[model samples]
Every structure is written in structure tokens, then in C-alpha cells.
Target chain A: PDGSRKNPARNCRDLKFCHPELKSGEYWVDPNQGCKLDAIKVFCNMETGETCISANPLNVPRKHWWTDSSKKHVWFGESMDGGFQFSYGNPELPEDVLDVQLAFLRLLSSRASQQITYHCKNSIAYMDQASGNVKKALKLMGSNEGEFKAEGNSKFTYTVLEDGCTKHTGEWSKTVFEYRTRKAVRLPIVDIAPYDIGGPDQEFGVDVGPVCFL
Target chain B: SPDGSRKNPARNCRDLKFCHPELKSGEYWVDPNQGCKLDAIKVFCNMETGETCISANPLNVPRKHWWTKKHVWFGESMDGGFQFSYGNPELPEDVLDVQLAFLRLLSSRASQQITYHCKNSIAYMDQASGNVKKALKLMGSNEGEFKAEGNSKFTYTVLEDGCTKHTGEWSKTVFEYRTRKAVRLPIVDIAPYDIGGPDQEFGVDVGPVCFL
Candidate 1:
């Protein structure tokens, strides 16, 4: 039968099915590493503040393999397109997405800018899903560059700058940016957590107040 | 025949002039029937200090002197008029002399009608001495038909009503009586006494300060 070609256990594992032996307080082990505990701290219920212990006979790891536990694990949970991959994830997503995220994270970590520039070939790419065309939204935020600074969070300040148009007249342009630094401590892991990490009840781990960069 | 020593008491009485008699013990003996006395020791009541002394002189006529003794004494020394024993001794010669000068001027223009205006009142001094009499006569004869505006200036149009007798009656019927009767000007003297006590000349020193 075609069912014989598929190993039920392996298929179950691929499907993110928990094994019967992997209970609360049991460690997650890698098969290739002789069932040794993986470098991860898995919590049973982050909401209940409950964590699990490693069953493998090995020292607890301080860091965790957030993406996967395999030898050649790649960091691929979901791309901006909501696609999954094993090696290089979501190539269709623009690099500006990561740039904006990194820029936001940097601003979150250290509010160090009077203004910020999000330069892309087209601003339509970073347009908000609900309200499309972020450029138009930015324009709505303020009439002038100086006024734009008041629209940002209290932590990191920002002001927009005007630059010359590029060859692609309607596309890429030399966008100048400026912003002020904020003063705050940023949690790296907390910052990279999924947008809806706590199911539906909790919010994303982020301080509402802005922080400045050192 | 001029008999020198022929007894004449009336002549002596005629020569008897009235003099200020002194008094003794506040009593003055007077011969009211004779109007003159000879060796009739008189005394006078000193009304002021309530003292008296003897007659000092004989044959001093006892007549009722109108003025006080001090005033009479002042008039006798300071005045130059006929010292008649009348009310207030004729205001003393020096004072009456000054008054006479003005009265002479007033009498000279006796026929003049003078109009005096003060504040809102008007008074018409007729070309006669007693203008009040004339005014009253006019009011009575005209049955109070005269209506004079009180407290207002009056313009006098002196109608040359010809001459009048000293008894205030018309005299000559023929004359240039159409001429205007002169209005007698009034003389006003303003004698201001320094009644202010100290600091009278305040304006002389320590000038006033101006406050903004």
C-alpha cells in the first residue's frame, strides 16, 4: 500500500506531533546526536509561566534553538509572505522588510535618531496591509519634515529629509533620514518573538515606551 | 449906657457852654429847669468802671451827650468839625471829612440816574437822593404795574425829565432837558485784612510739587 512508504512516526514528527515519551519536564533530543538533549529550553505553558526540564543526560543549555534542533537547522519560521522553508526562506520577500524590522528593532533597542528613512524602490512594498501606501500615510502624519517628528513615539525622535529623484523617476530615490537615540534596554529574544507568540490572550513582548540607542 | 456890672444872669446863662462834667460817687446834680448852673456842684455816673468824681469845673452845662466819653474825647482832639452834641458826635470830623468828599461828588450829580447791577439783581438809583421813595411812589401810583426782573442787569435810559426843585419837584419848564442825566459811578473799596495766622506766605517758599 502507499501508506507503507510513509513511516508513521517520522511523518508524525514532521507534522509537529509530540511523542508519548516527550512529556512535561522531558528534554527534546536530536536523533543524530544519540538522543542527546538539544540546546533548547522549551516551556510547556508560557502563559502559566511553566517550563520543562531536559530528560537527556546532559547539562542544560543557556541558549535555545528557536528555529529547529537539526544539525543543519535554518532559521525559518515564517517569512513576510507567510511561506516556510528549510534552507533559504522566502526569497520573494524584499530585503527592505528585514531592513525595516532591523531598523525598528534598533530603534526599539536604542532610540538613536531624529529621523529615519525607509528607502525602497517603491514604498508600496512596505505599505500597511490595512491602509495601503505608507507614503501617503506618512504625508497624512505631518505636512512638513519638522512636523513629522511630532508623529513618532516619545522615545526616539524623527524628522524627514528631501533628496533628489533617481533615474527610475517614479521608483528609487536618494532618501535622507535623521532620528534621535532613545535610552532603554532591549531584550533580543523578546524582540524576535512572533507577533502573536502568546496565542490570542497576550500581546507581543514589547515595551510601549520607546528606548534610546547607546 | 453900657453898665458893665449890671446883674445879668441870662447873659451868664447864654455864656454857659456845655462841657463834659466829672462825677462824684456816681451821681451828677443837674438843674434841669435852668439848663445852666453856677456853683451847683455836679457829679456824673461813670458807666464803664462804675466810679465817679467831682465836677472839676463850675458852670459846666449838663446836657445829654450822645457819644461815649472816650469817643467824645477822640472827636474833640482828632476831629475838625462843629462839635455838636448829636448821635455819635457826627462820626468824628476826620471820618465825616472823608465821607463828605464822596457825598459832594454824589450831590454834584444829584440829577443823574444810576443803574447798579450786581450778580443777578438790578437797582436803579434815580436822579434823586431818595430813589426808594420815588420807586415806592411809582409802585403805589401805578397800582403795582411795575415788573422789575430780579437778579438781572438793568440798562438805565435816563429821560431828561427837566429840572426839579430841592423839594424833589419839577422847577424850570424851559431848558435843554432832553440831555442824558449822568449816571453816578459807585466807589467800592476792598480792604482785605491778613486774617491767615502762620504760614500765610506759603507760596513764597517751598514751591508746590507736581505729581504725575
Candidate 2:
């Protein structure tokens, strides 16, 4: 055997070792959000193939925000006007690359499972437990959870802020997602419906892949 | 703390109250894992009008092999190398490397001995080839064939020595080990976890060395 050392043709990263969901931006995993606490927009841009990346971590003010130089808007907070496809979902603030679902969960609940969420706004709470197909569900904060409750179905959602804690919501509903292991799990989608709205059966939805807050 | 420090207690999925699932989204505090990598994901049915909030997590993966194996399981290394345990090799607490570490602790008074190398970790003590050598070593014959063997829990016969020459003398009931000639050899240990994965940085384990 020759003593010359040979190197691997390609480190798997440039080839296939990347997680499968990275291609479509549909099943996005902010590797950072999953690890170190980094801004979601900064991390999302890196994994999205269409968006180019800086060779290293950014250092300055705009560094925290991903930039195509003068080509695109800064990462998250800057309002978008012309053609920002990724919306951070703030109609009131005019921000793109944001989604309302993220906004709600971040405020009202632990990022675990939306298996159960309650929004106490104006002192009235909405429930969305159908996706869980859950016969019963409970929400707890220490020992302060009110007496447990569940009915047929309805809508739910989370937000703004003051100091310690405040609750917000207009409506609530349910949705389902599939995991990689050929398994199905349902979580509330933060909207409302009782199968008895103006129309007995009505809906709005989209398809996505093996995803989770974590 | 930028993490759980200042959060708006009112955040939850509401009124399309949807913030950015990841930040300033959950509450005054950023409920982590929002819109992140979902081992499982979410979807509201369309033309169906049913939406709800996601609040359960995909718990830890389940595995039967980890606790059920009768023998000690060697863990994997980060460099994509593996190590497996056979015959419940009793490991010492004050140990660094398993193979060499265990070797240092073996009693010099075993009735017999042989050397072993493992193509894979299991082959050394519990697999077919392992049994083959155990059979030959028990016969007190070295030239018959190259081999290895392991036992069920209590069979404490030790096949000692590095990956080189060890001599055996024939006695009808036992294979006596001792006497040696000069020769060089290679050795290693293997582990059970995916060697190609993470956390297993220092525990590689070369496979065993033996004949047949």
C-alpha cells in the first residue's frame, strides 16, 4: 500500500448529508433556531437554497439582518414594500418573512405542541383541541389552571404585550400534520369553526412536511 | 435573559395573532421551537375551515435495544466509527479506553488464552466466529484454526494478549496460554450507537483480533 494519504471526494455537506426538507423552503429548519438561539430570519435565509449566504457570521448592525446588499430588505423587522414573498405575517406592521402562527405560539404557549392552547382575551377563552382528536386536554401554569374543560369544537389563537402576562385572541381552530415515521398528529391551528358557522362545512388550509416548533 | 426574560404573557395562536412562530411570537417571552424543525409538522384543512393551535411536542424516540441487551453496549465515536460490547465485559470505573483498559485489569491466572480481532464489535465475544474460537481454544489447540468464543454471563475464561503471538499447550480439558514469540499487531474496539453521529467524541473502540 502506498503511504500517500487520500482525502474524501466531498464532505457530505456539499453532497447529501443535509436534511432533506431544506430544498423547498417549505419544510424549513432554522438550524440555529434548533440549536443556538438565533433570529429565525437570519437562520432561515441560510438554509433556503435560493437565498445566498455570507461565508461567515455577520458582525455589525445590519449583520443581524440578512442582506442581498441593496438588493433586498433587511432580515426580519424592516417593512417590505415591492416584492417580499416571505412575510413575517404582520399586517399591522407591514413586515414580510413572518407568519402569524409563529407570532402567536411565541407569546401564549411553550413551543412544544399546540395540542392545546387557550387565549383569555376580554376574559373569554377559545378552544381548539379537535386536531389532537383529544377527548380531553388541559392547559396549566403552575397550579393556577382553571378547572379542566372540553366541548365538541371551536377556534383559538395568541399576543401583543404589556409586562408580566396578558392574554389575546379573537378565534381558534384545529389542524393536522404528519411526522416522518408514517404517523399522524394533530394540533390546533389558532382559528375558529364549530362545523356550524354560517356554513356547516367550510375551511382553509395548506400542506407541509415533517415539521415542529423544535 | 434574551431567551425567557421579557415576554408578553398574552402571546398564543390567536386572531391570526400569529406573530413569527419563532420569536416575540409566543409571549413577552419567545416560546422557543416555534416554526422550527418539526419532527412532526402542522396543517389546517382547506375548504374545511378547521384550524387549531399546536401545543404538543414529539417526545423522545423509543428504542428497545438500549436497555435490553444482556451485555454491556459500547457506545459509538464521532468520527463515524463504532464499538459493540460482547459477553458483558465488565468495565472498570477508572477507565479511559475500554479495550486497553479492560486488558490491564484481567487476572494473569486464567486457565488458557488466545488473541482476538473484530471485523465488527459483536463478532468478538458473542457472534458465530467468536464461538468458533472459543471452541478451538477450549480444545487446547492453536494450529487447528484461528478463532474466538464468549460465554453466557458466568463463563469468565479470558482470551488475553494484544494482537500477536500467544502459545497454547494441549491438555484434554483445557488450552493453557503462555510462552510467546516476537511479532507486531494491530488492535481496536467498536461501539453500538451510530458511529457517524454526534456526542460520541472520545469512545471509538477498535474491533477484536483473532484467527478464523
Candidate 3:
């Protein structure tokens, strides 16, 4: 990807620092390297006056989670050793432009934060340890070929136990985390060692959202 | 500035709006009725109107189920018949509290609207048609009913003024309906209960309730 001094906004963060007039709504964003029509229209969350790009939560059902190379933008399951990677686009930018922009935004804004939520059912044991395994399983990599050591407040972690997918009323562990980092990163990667065994009632997924620039 | 925690300390969308004045409309998790033995719930915030609403399906327990056929002229309700003579369905205490909190967010400016979708039954035949209309009148609903397609159904809306019920025409909003259940114990036991079939029973699908 070539660099562009024009329309430096590769994500919501850029829009945040550059376009103070913009509010929370759908706007054309140049997530690519240049200001091309290829720029995707995304919902910018300016609620807190911070530029945040919101995306729908990605859910991978149990049936095709393994070796599902066909899956785009996200890949995980036993075939990947329980690894999970959520990227801005499929075949992520070689410059890993999103990471680059997030990094650049940090320089201007001081920091960037990403809020993630996971809701898994009938798998209390795995979810119980999922947040703790972040150190070992979570990775934020940027185009600079560097890893962003995003730190999240441990106190921000909590589980909402509910019955979502079981007949007998098992807990659907919903966990949330807010991770902050100055380091640039393209996406969040997690390899939390999957159990390689799950039934119909057992399901797992994560919602990567509102990458906020502040 | 009140604070409590389980993470995402904001009690509801109102709190979110209070914390972030620019917070727009969206689905967000709020811990309402917090520490009252409750978990976080998702609520839609209508920032445009500065109101937060919870999504719940209205309880449409057919009056048919409330009646048991017997030789007697009155209904032998195994599970007490519908409590309200009208459409004021009862809701769970926690849900009521949360909705109360939502209305309280706006203080005296708070208000609620409930749109009722009523289907025609045999009970609406001829002179009996006046029966349902009179009931609505007693409930303080002077609003004229609007007919639906093929006249199979008709709808009217009621606004809760300062938590007091009143009725009028209908309007639209991004408001969500709240859930309610049948109240316990029947209050009336009149005779000639089998005058008409179950199809002739009276009831209304009350919902898509909104608060602001």
C-alpha cells in the first residue's frame, strides 16, 4: 500500500483528530492507504467525542469452527489451536494499515482503546479462564511489525451469567474487556487453547467493537 | 454521579447519556435494578427524545384460558382469571422498577405510551360491540379506534400521564414494548358465562409500550 498525505484518515481515529465536526453516524472512511472510493462506509461512534469504528460482533458456531479456512475476516477453532484473529479486512493489509493508523492516532491522541465482549454458552470453565489467558493468548500486531502491549484494567472484567442456549438453563458467560494501548496494532489475535470438543449446547464467540481513539 | 460496579457501572441508557452527553441512539447494556439481584440488560436509548426503552413482548394471555367450562353460569378459573377489567396488564416487579427508573430519568417530564392491537372477536358482535368500547371508556380511553386492514384488527393508543393512564391517537417512535403477565385472582364472577363461545371472548394485545 502506498502512503497518502491527503485524507490521512485510515479509520475513525483519524476522523476524530481531523474532523471535529463529525458526529456519530455513517461516514465514508478511507481504511485503505489512499482517499479512494474503495474507502468503506462505516458507522463512526463520536458519542464520547472520540472517533470509534463500530462493527458487528463475530459469532462462529460449533459445527464449522474447525479448519474453516473459508471463513473471512476471522479464523479460530480447534484447527487453529483455539486461536482467533479479528482483522479489519480479509487478507489483512500488508502494511497492516489499520494497525499503522491506530499507532499514528495514538501519537496524536495519546492512546487508543478497543472494547471486546464475548458470550459463550455451557462452557463456564473455559470462559472462566479466558480473560486470564489474554497475556498468553491475546496479541495486537501492527504494520510496523511490532506488537502493541495493550493493557486492560483487570477491574473492568466481569461475567454476566445467563441461560441462552441450554434446555436445562446453563450459564451463557458474557464477559467484557476494555484494552488500551499506545502501540499500533492491526487486530487482536487470541489463541486460548481450545478444548477441541464442543456439543450443540456449547458455543463461543466474541464481539470486537468500538475501537475508540482518545 | 452515583456509582456502583460490576463493570459498565452505568445503570441504564439514561446513565450513559448522563455520562456522555453526546451518546446517541444504540443498543447498550445497562445494570438496572442493580444489586437488587439483577444482571445487566440491553436497552435502546432514544437520545433524540432523551428517553431509554426496554424491549419486551406484551403479555397477551387470552381471556379464553382464564375460563373453564362447567354446568355453572360463572367461570371456574383454576388459575384466577384476568385481574384488570381492562388492558392494564401486570408486569414483573423488577421490570416495573426498571421502567420506573427509566421514567424517573426524565423526572416530571417523564411519560409513557402504550399502543394496543385489538383483534375482533365474536364478543364485538352487534350490541356487544358496545361492551368493549364501554370498558375502554371506563379506563379513561376516549380515543377513537383506528381500523386495520380488512377491519380484522383495530388499534388505539394510551398515554400514561404522570403515571396515570389516559388515551388518544397513535404516533411512532423507536420505543420498545415491555413484558407483562396475567394478574392473579379474578375479581368478577357474573352468570351466563357460556352465552358465547371462546371466539366471543374479550382481550387486547397491549404492547410496544414506550416511555420518555
Candidate 4:
């Protein structure tokens, strides 16, 4: 509608640049522009040609991905990174300004065969990647742009540049609320407990994605 | 050095700090250190022996997966690059975590007043974030541009070396998260039967939490 717009589900050369493995299947994030929030972009790569999605996206299942840093910041040296693992896109995955994240939940109908199951969506995807970004974009997209939404009548547009960065105008209002906002007590995180390996105690778990270990 | 280099060497595999002490005198691949800041990986025996080596030519780390960062790990040098246990470039993460915490806690913190400052900061930070959450909610928007960024330095500080490092008190990074799953098989296939649960499966990506 404006100069800043969503670029289809493909041509995400940047996401493809950093994560070049996406050959087939479809990419849902505009990547270059804000599917909603210019600062964050969220994407889910689903294609039958791909492998290992043991956990299917049936019903309204959420999937998320966060990265303090991703291919877009390919300058060099160390930088922060975090992403939601898999969520259907609900708030609480949690950034930017400081941390960045993206979330999605697919609502679909499934047809099953002995070989494999098929899923087609009555769904929508969030753009960019961040809890705050996704949460707001979620608000804007669902037309929940009402009832305690950001206290304004603001909307914005975004565009990605050759330098592989986002450029845009307008405003996406912020919805205010209080959160414990701690990295611990994650609703999406799994607690696998203290397992000893004759070394230290190692715990295994996953959450909607902000934290990770080597 | 142009002699051999990866684009980023800040986390170069040679930073002897994370160096493995058990590695022997033979040649092996070190951790992918280009991200650290070296033309090549730094090699060592135990801690950083300052002992180093590199290859005039290198090849992409071969794997079923694709991409440089994903496929890269292990290193080499004239002396020798460090390596993963069981002869792999990486180990099962949870397996590694248990080993590291068990090693450090008995094992990872320290001191009285000083410890309070560090650990205490976590509490304050959580509060700060929650409060800032509201601030951002109504501030129209920011295009993710960090135009207002700058480091704020401290006035006084010193590392604590006396009276209990208090490491285990906080080995709890994500030790208590409620839900998780091991996504990948450990680099070392025979990871015992039940140490990590179910099939001892490890994660595919960096994983969902620091606990992973």
C-alpha cells in the first residue's frame, strides 16, 4: 500500500544468504521488510520436500525463533543472539532495541495417509523476530488494534535495502503492560533436570528461544 | 594474518581459556575459532600452552548439513589444534554441560559482598526489564536502530580470589526450566543408556535454552 511493504513469501535473499539451506519449501517471512514490526522479522520454513518435522503443526500450534544476531548482522566478530524454538506465536517468548525475537502459531486442517500427514493453513505468519515485535504485530494483524492496544492511531511501513538492512517510516504503537520479564521461569522452556556425566550437572530443555548452551 | 584467516576471529578457536587440557600431542581439529579472531585455530595441550599451528590450505568441514558456520568445527596446527572428547569436533551439549558443571561446581561463582553484586544484578535486571517493557509498549516505535547505544563503564571493580568462589550457587542458569527435549544424537554415539533421559538425544540447533 505504501513505499514500505511486505515482499511476498520469497526473495528473502538475506535469510537465504545466512541460512542458505532453504532450497525448496516456502519461506513465510518477508525477511527484508516488516511483516509488521520493522525491527523484527519472523519466518517458518515448511515444505514437504524437507525432512524431520516429527512434531507436526496441527491445530493452532505455535512455533518461534529468536536470534540476538542472525545473518543480517554478518559484519564479523561476536554479537548477541537468541530465538524462540517452536511456538505458535504467543507473547512471552520475548526483543529488541535490546533483544529480538519472532513467533508463529499455525492453525490448520490435516489429512492423514499411511505414508505421511498433510497440513494446510487457515493461518497467518508474523514478520521480523522478537517478542515485543511479534506481540505488537500480532495485535496489528489480528485487528486487535483496539481495546488496550498502543494508545494511538499509529501504523508504519518498512523496506529492506541492498545493504541488507531495514529502512522505513510510520509508527507501530506499543501496548503497555507489566511482566516479570526474567529469563528464568520460562513458560515455553522444558526442564530436564540435573543429569550428571561424571563431570558437572547438565540440564536439557527448550523454550520458545532466547537462551542456549554449547 | 592473510597467511590463513576466516572473516571473524574474535572467538577464534585459539583462546586457550576454553582450551581442553586432556588433548594429547597428536594433530587434531580445534574448535572453529575464526569467529574468535585468528587466521587459524590456536592449538594447545591443556591450558593455552602458547603452542600453536595452522594449515596453509583448508577445506570446508564436511557434513550432511550445509553452510560454513554450521558445518565448521575442529581445527589443526603444526603443534596441534584442540579437539572434542571421543574424537569428535563437538560433544553432546547436555553431556558436556553435566561434565562442565560437575567439574566446576565441586563446580562455576565466588566471594561474599562481590558475589552479591554480580548475582544481585540479575534480580535488579529482571525488574528493570519488566519496567522497560511498559516503556516500549507506548513509545510509538523504534526501527531497531540502536542510535542511542554506548557502553557505561564502572567506577571500581576487582575479581574475587578469596574465600569460596561460590560457583555452584548459580549453576542454575536454566537448570529448572519446565519443558525440554534432546534434539540431536551426541557426537559420541554411545552416550550410555540413561544419563540424559529417553534415548540420550541431543538438540539440532543451539537448542531452546541454555539448559540444553
**Deviation (Å) of A157 in candidate 2:** 24
Question: Which segments of model 4 are wrong by more than 4 Å?
Answer: A1-57, A60-214, B1-28, B31-45, B48-212
Candidate 3 docking DockQ: 0.01
Q: Which candidate ranks first by lDDT, i.e. highest? A: 3
Tens digits of per-residue lDDT, candidate 2, A132-188, equal 232222221111111112332221112111111122233232233211110001222
Using Cα atoms, each model's DockQ against the true complex is: 0.00, 0.01, 0.01, 0.01
Rank by DockQ, highest first: 2, 4, 3, 1
Error of 4 at A77 (Å): 41
Model 1, position B201, has a per-residue lDDT of 11
Indicate the TM-score of model 2: 0.19
TM-score of structure candidate 3 = 0.31
> Which ten contiguous residues of candidate 1 chain B have the minimum total lDDT?
B203-212
lDDT of 1 by residue, A1-214 (tens): 0001121111112112223333333222111112222222222222221222211211111122233213121211232123222111123435444233333223222122222233333222123334532332221111111222224554323344543222122344333334433221121111111211112221111111111122
Q: Which sequence of candidate numbers ranks them by TM-score, best first?
A: 3, 2, 4, 1
Could you estimate the TM-score for every candidate? 0.15, 0.19, 0.31, 0.17
Backbone clashes counted, model 2: 104
Give Cα-based local distance difference scores for all models: 0.22, 0.21, 0.37, 0.20
DockQ: which is higher, 1 or 4?
A: 4
True contacts kept of each: 0.00, 0.00, 0.00, 0.00
Q: Write the per-residue lDDT of candidate 4 for residues B145-183, one digit (tens) a residue.
A: 111112221011213212112222221111111111111
Kindly list the per-residue Cα lDDT of model 3 for residues B106-203, writing each as its tens digit: 33232223322222221111233323232221111112222111232223233321111112222111111111210111112222122233333333
Tell how far residue B192 is off in model 1, in angstroms.
Answer: 68
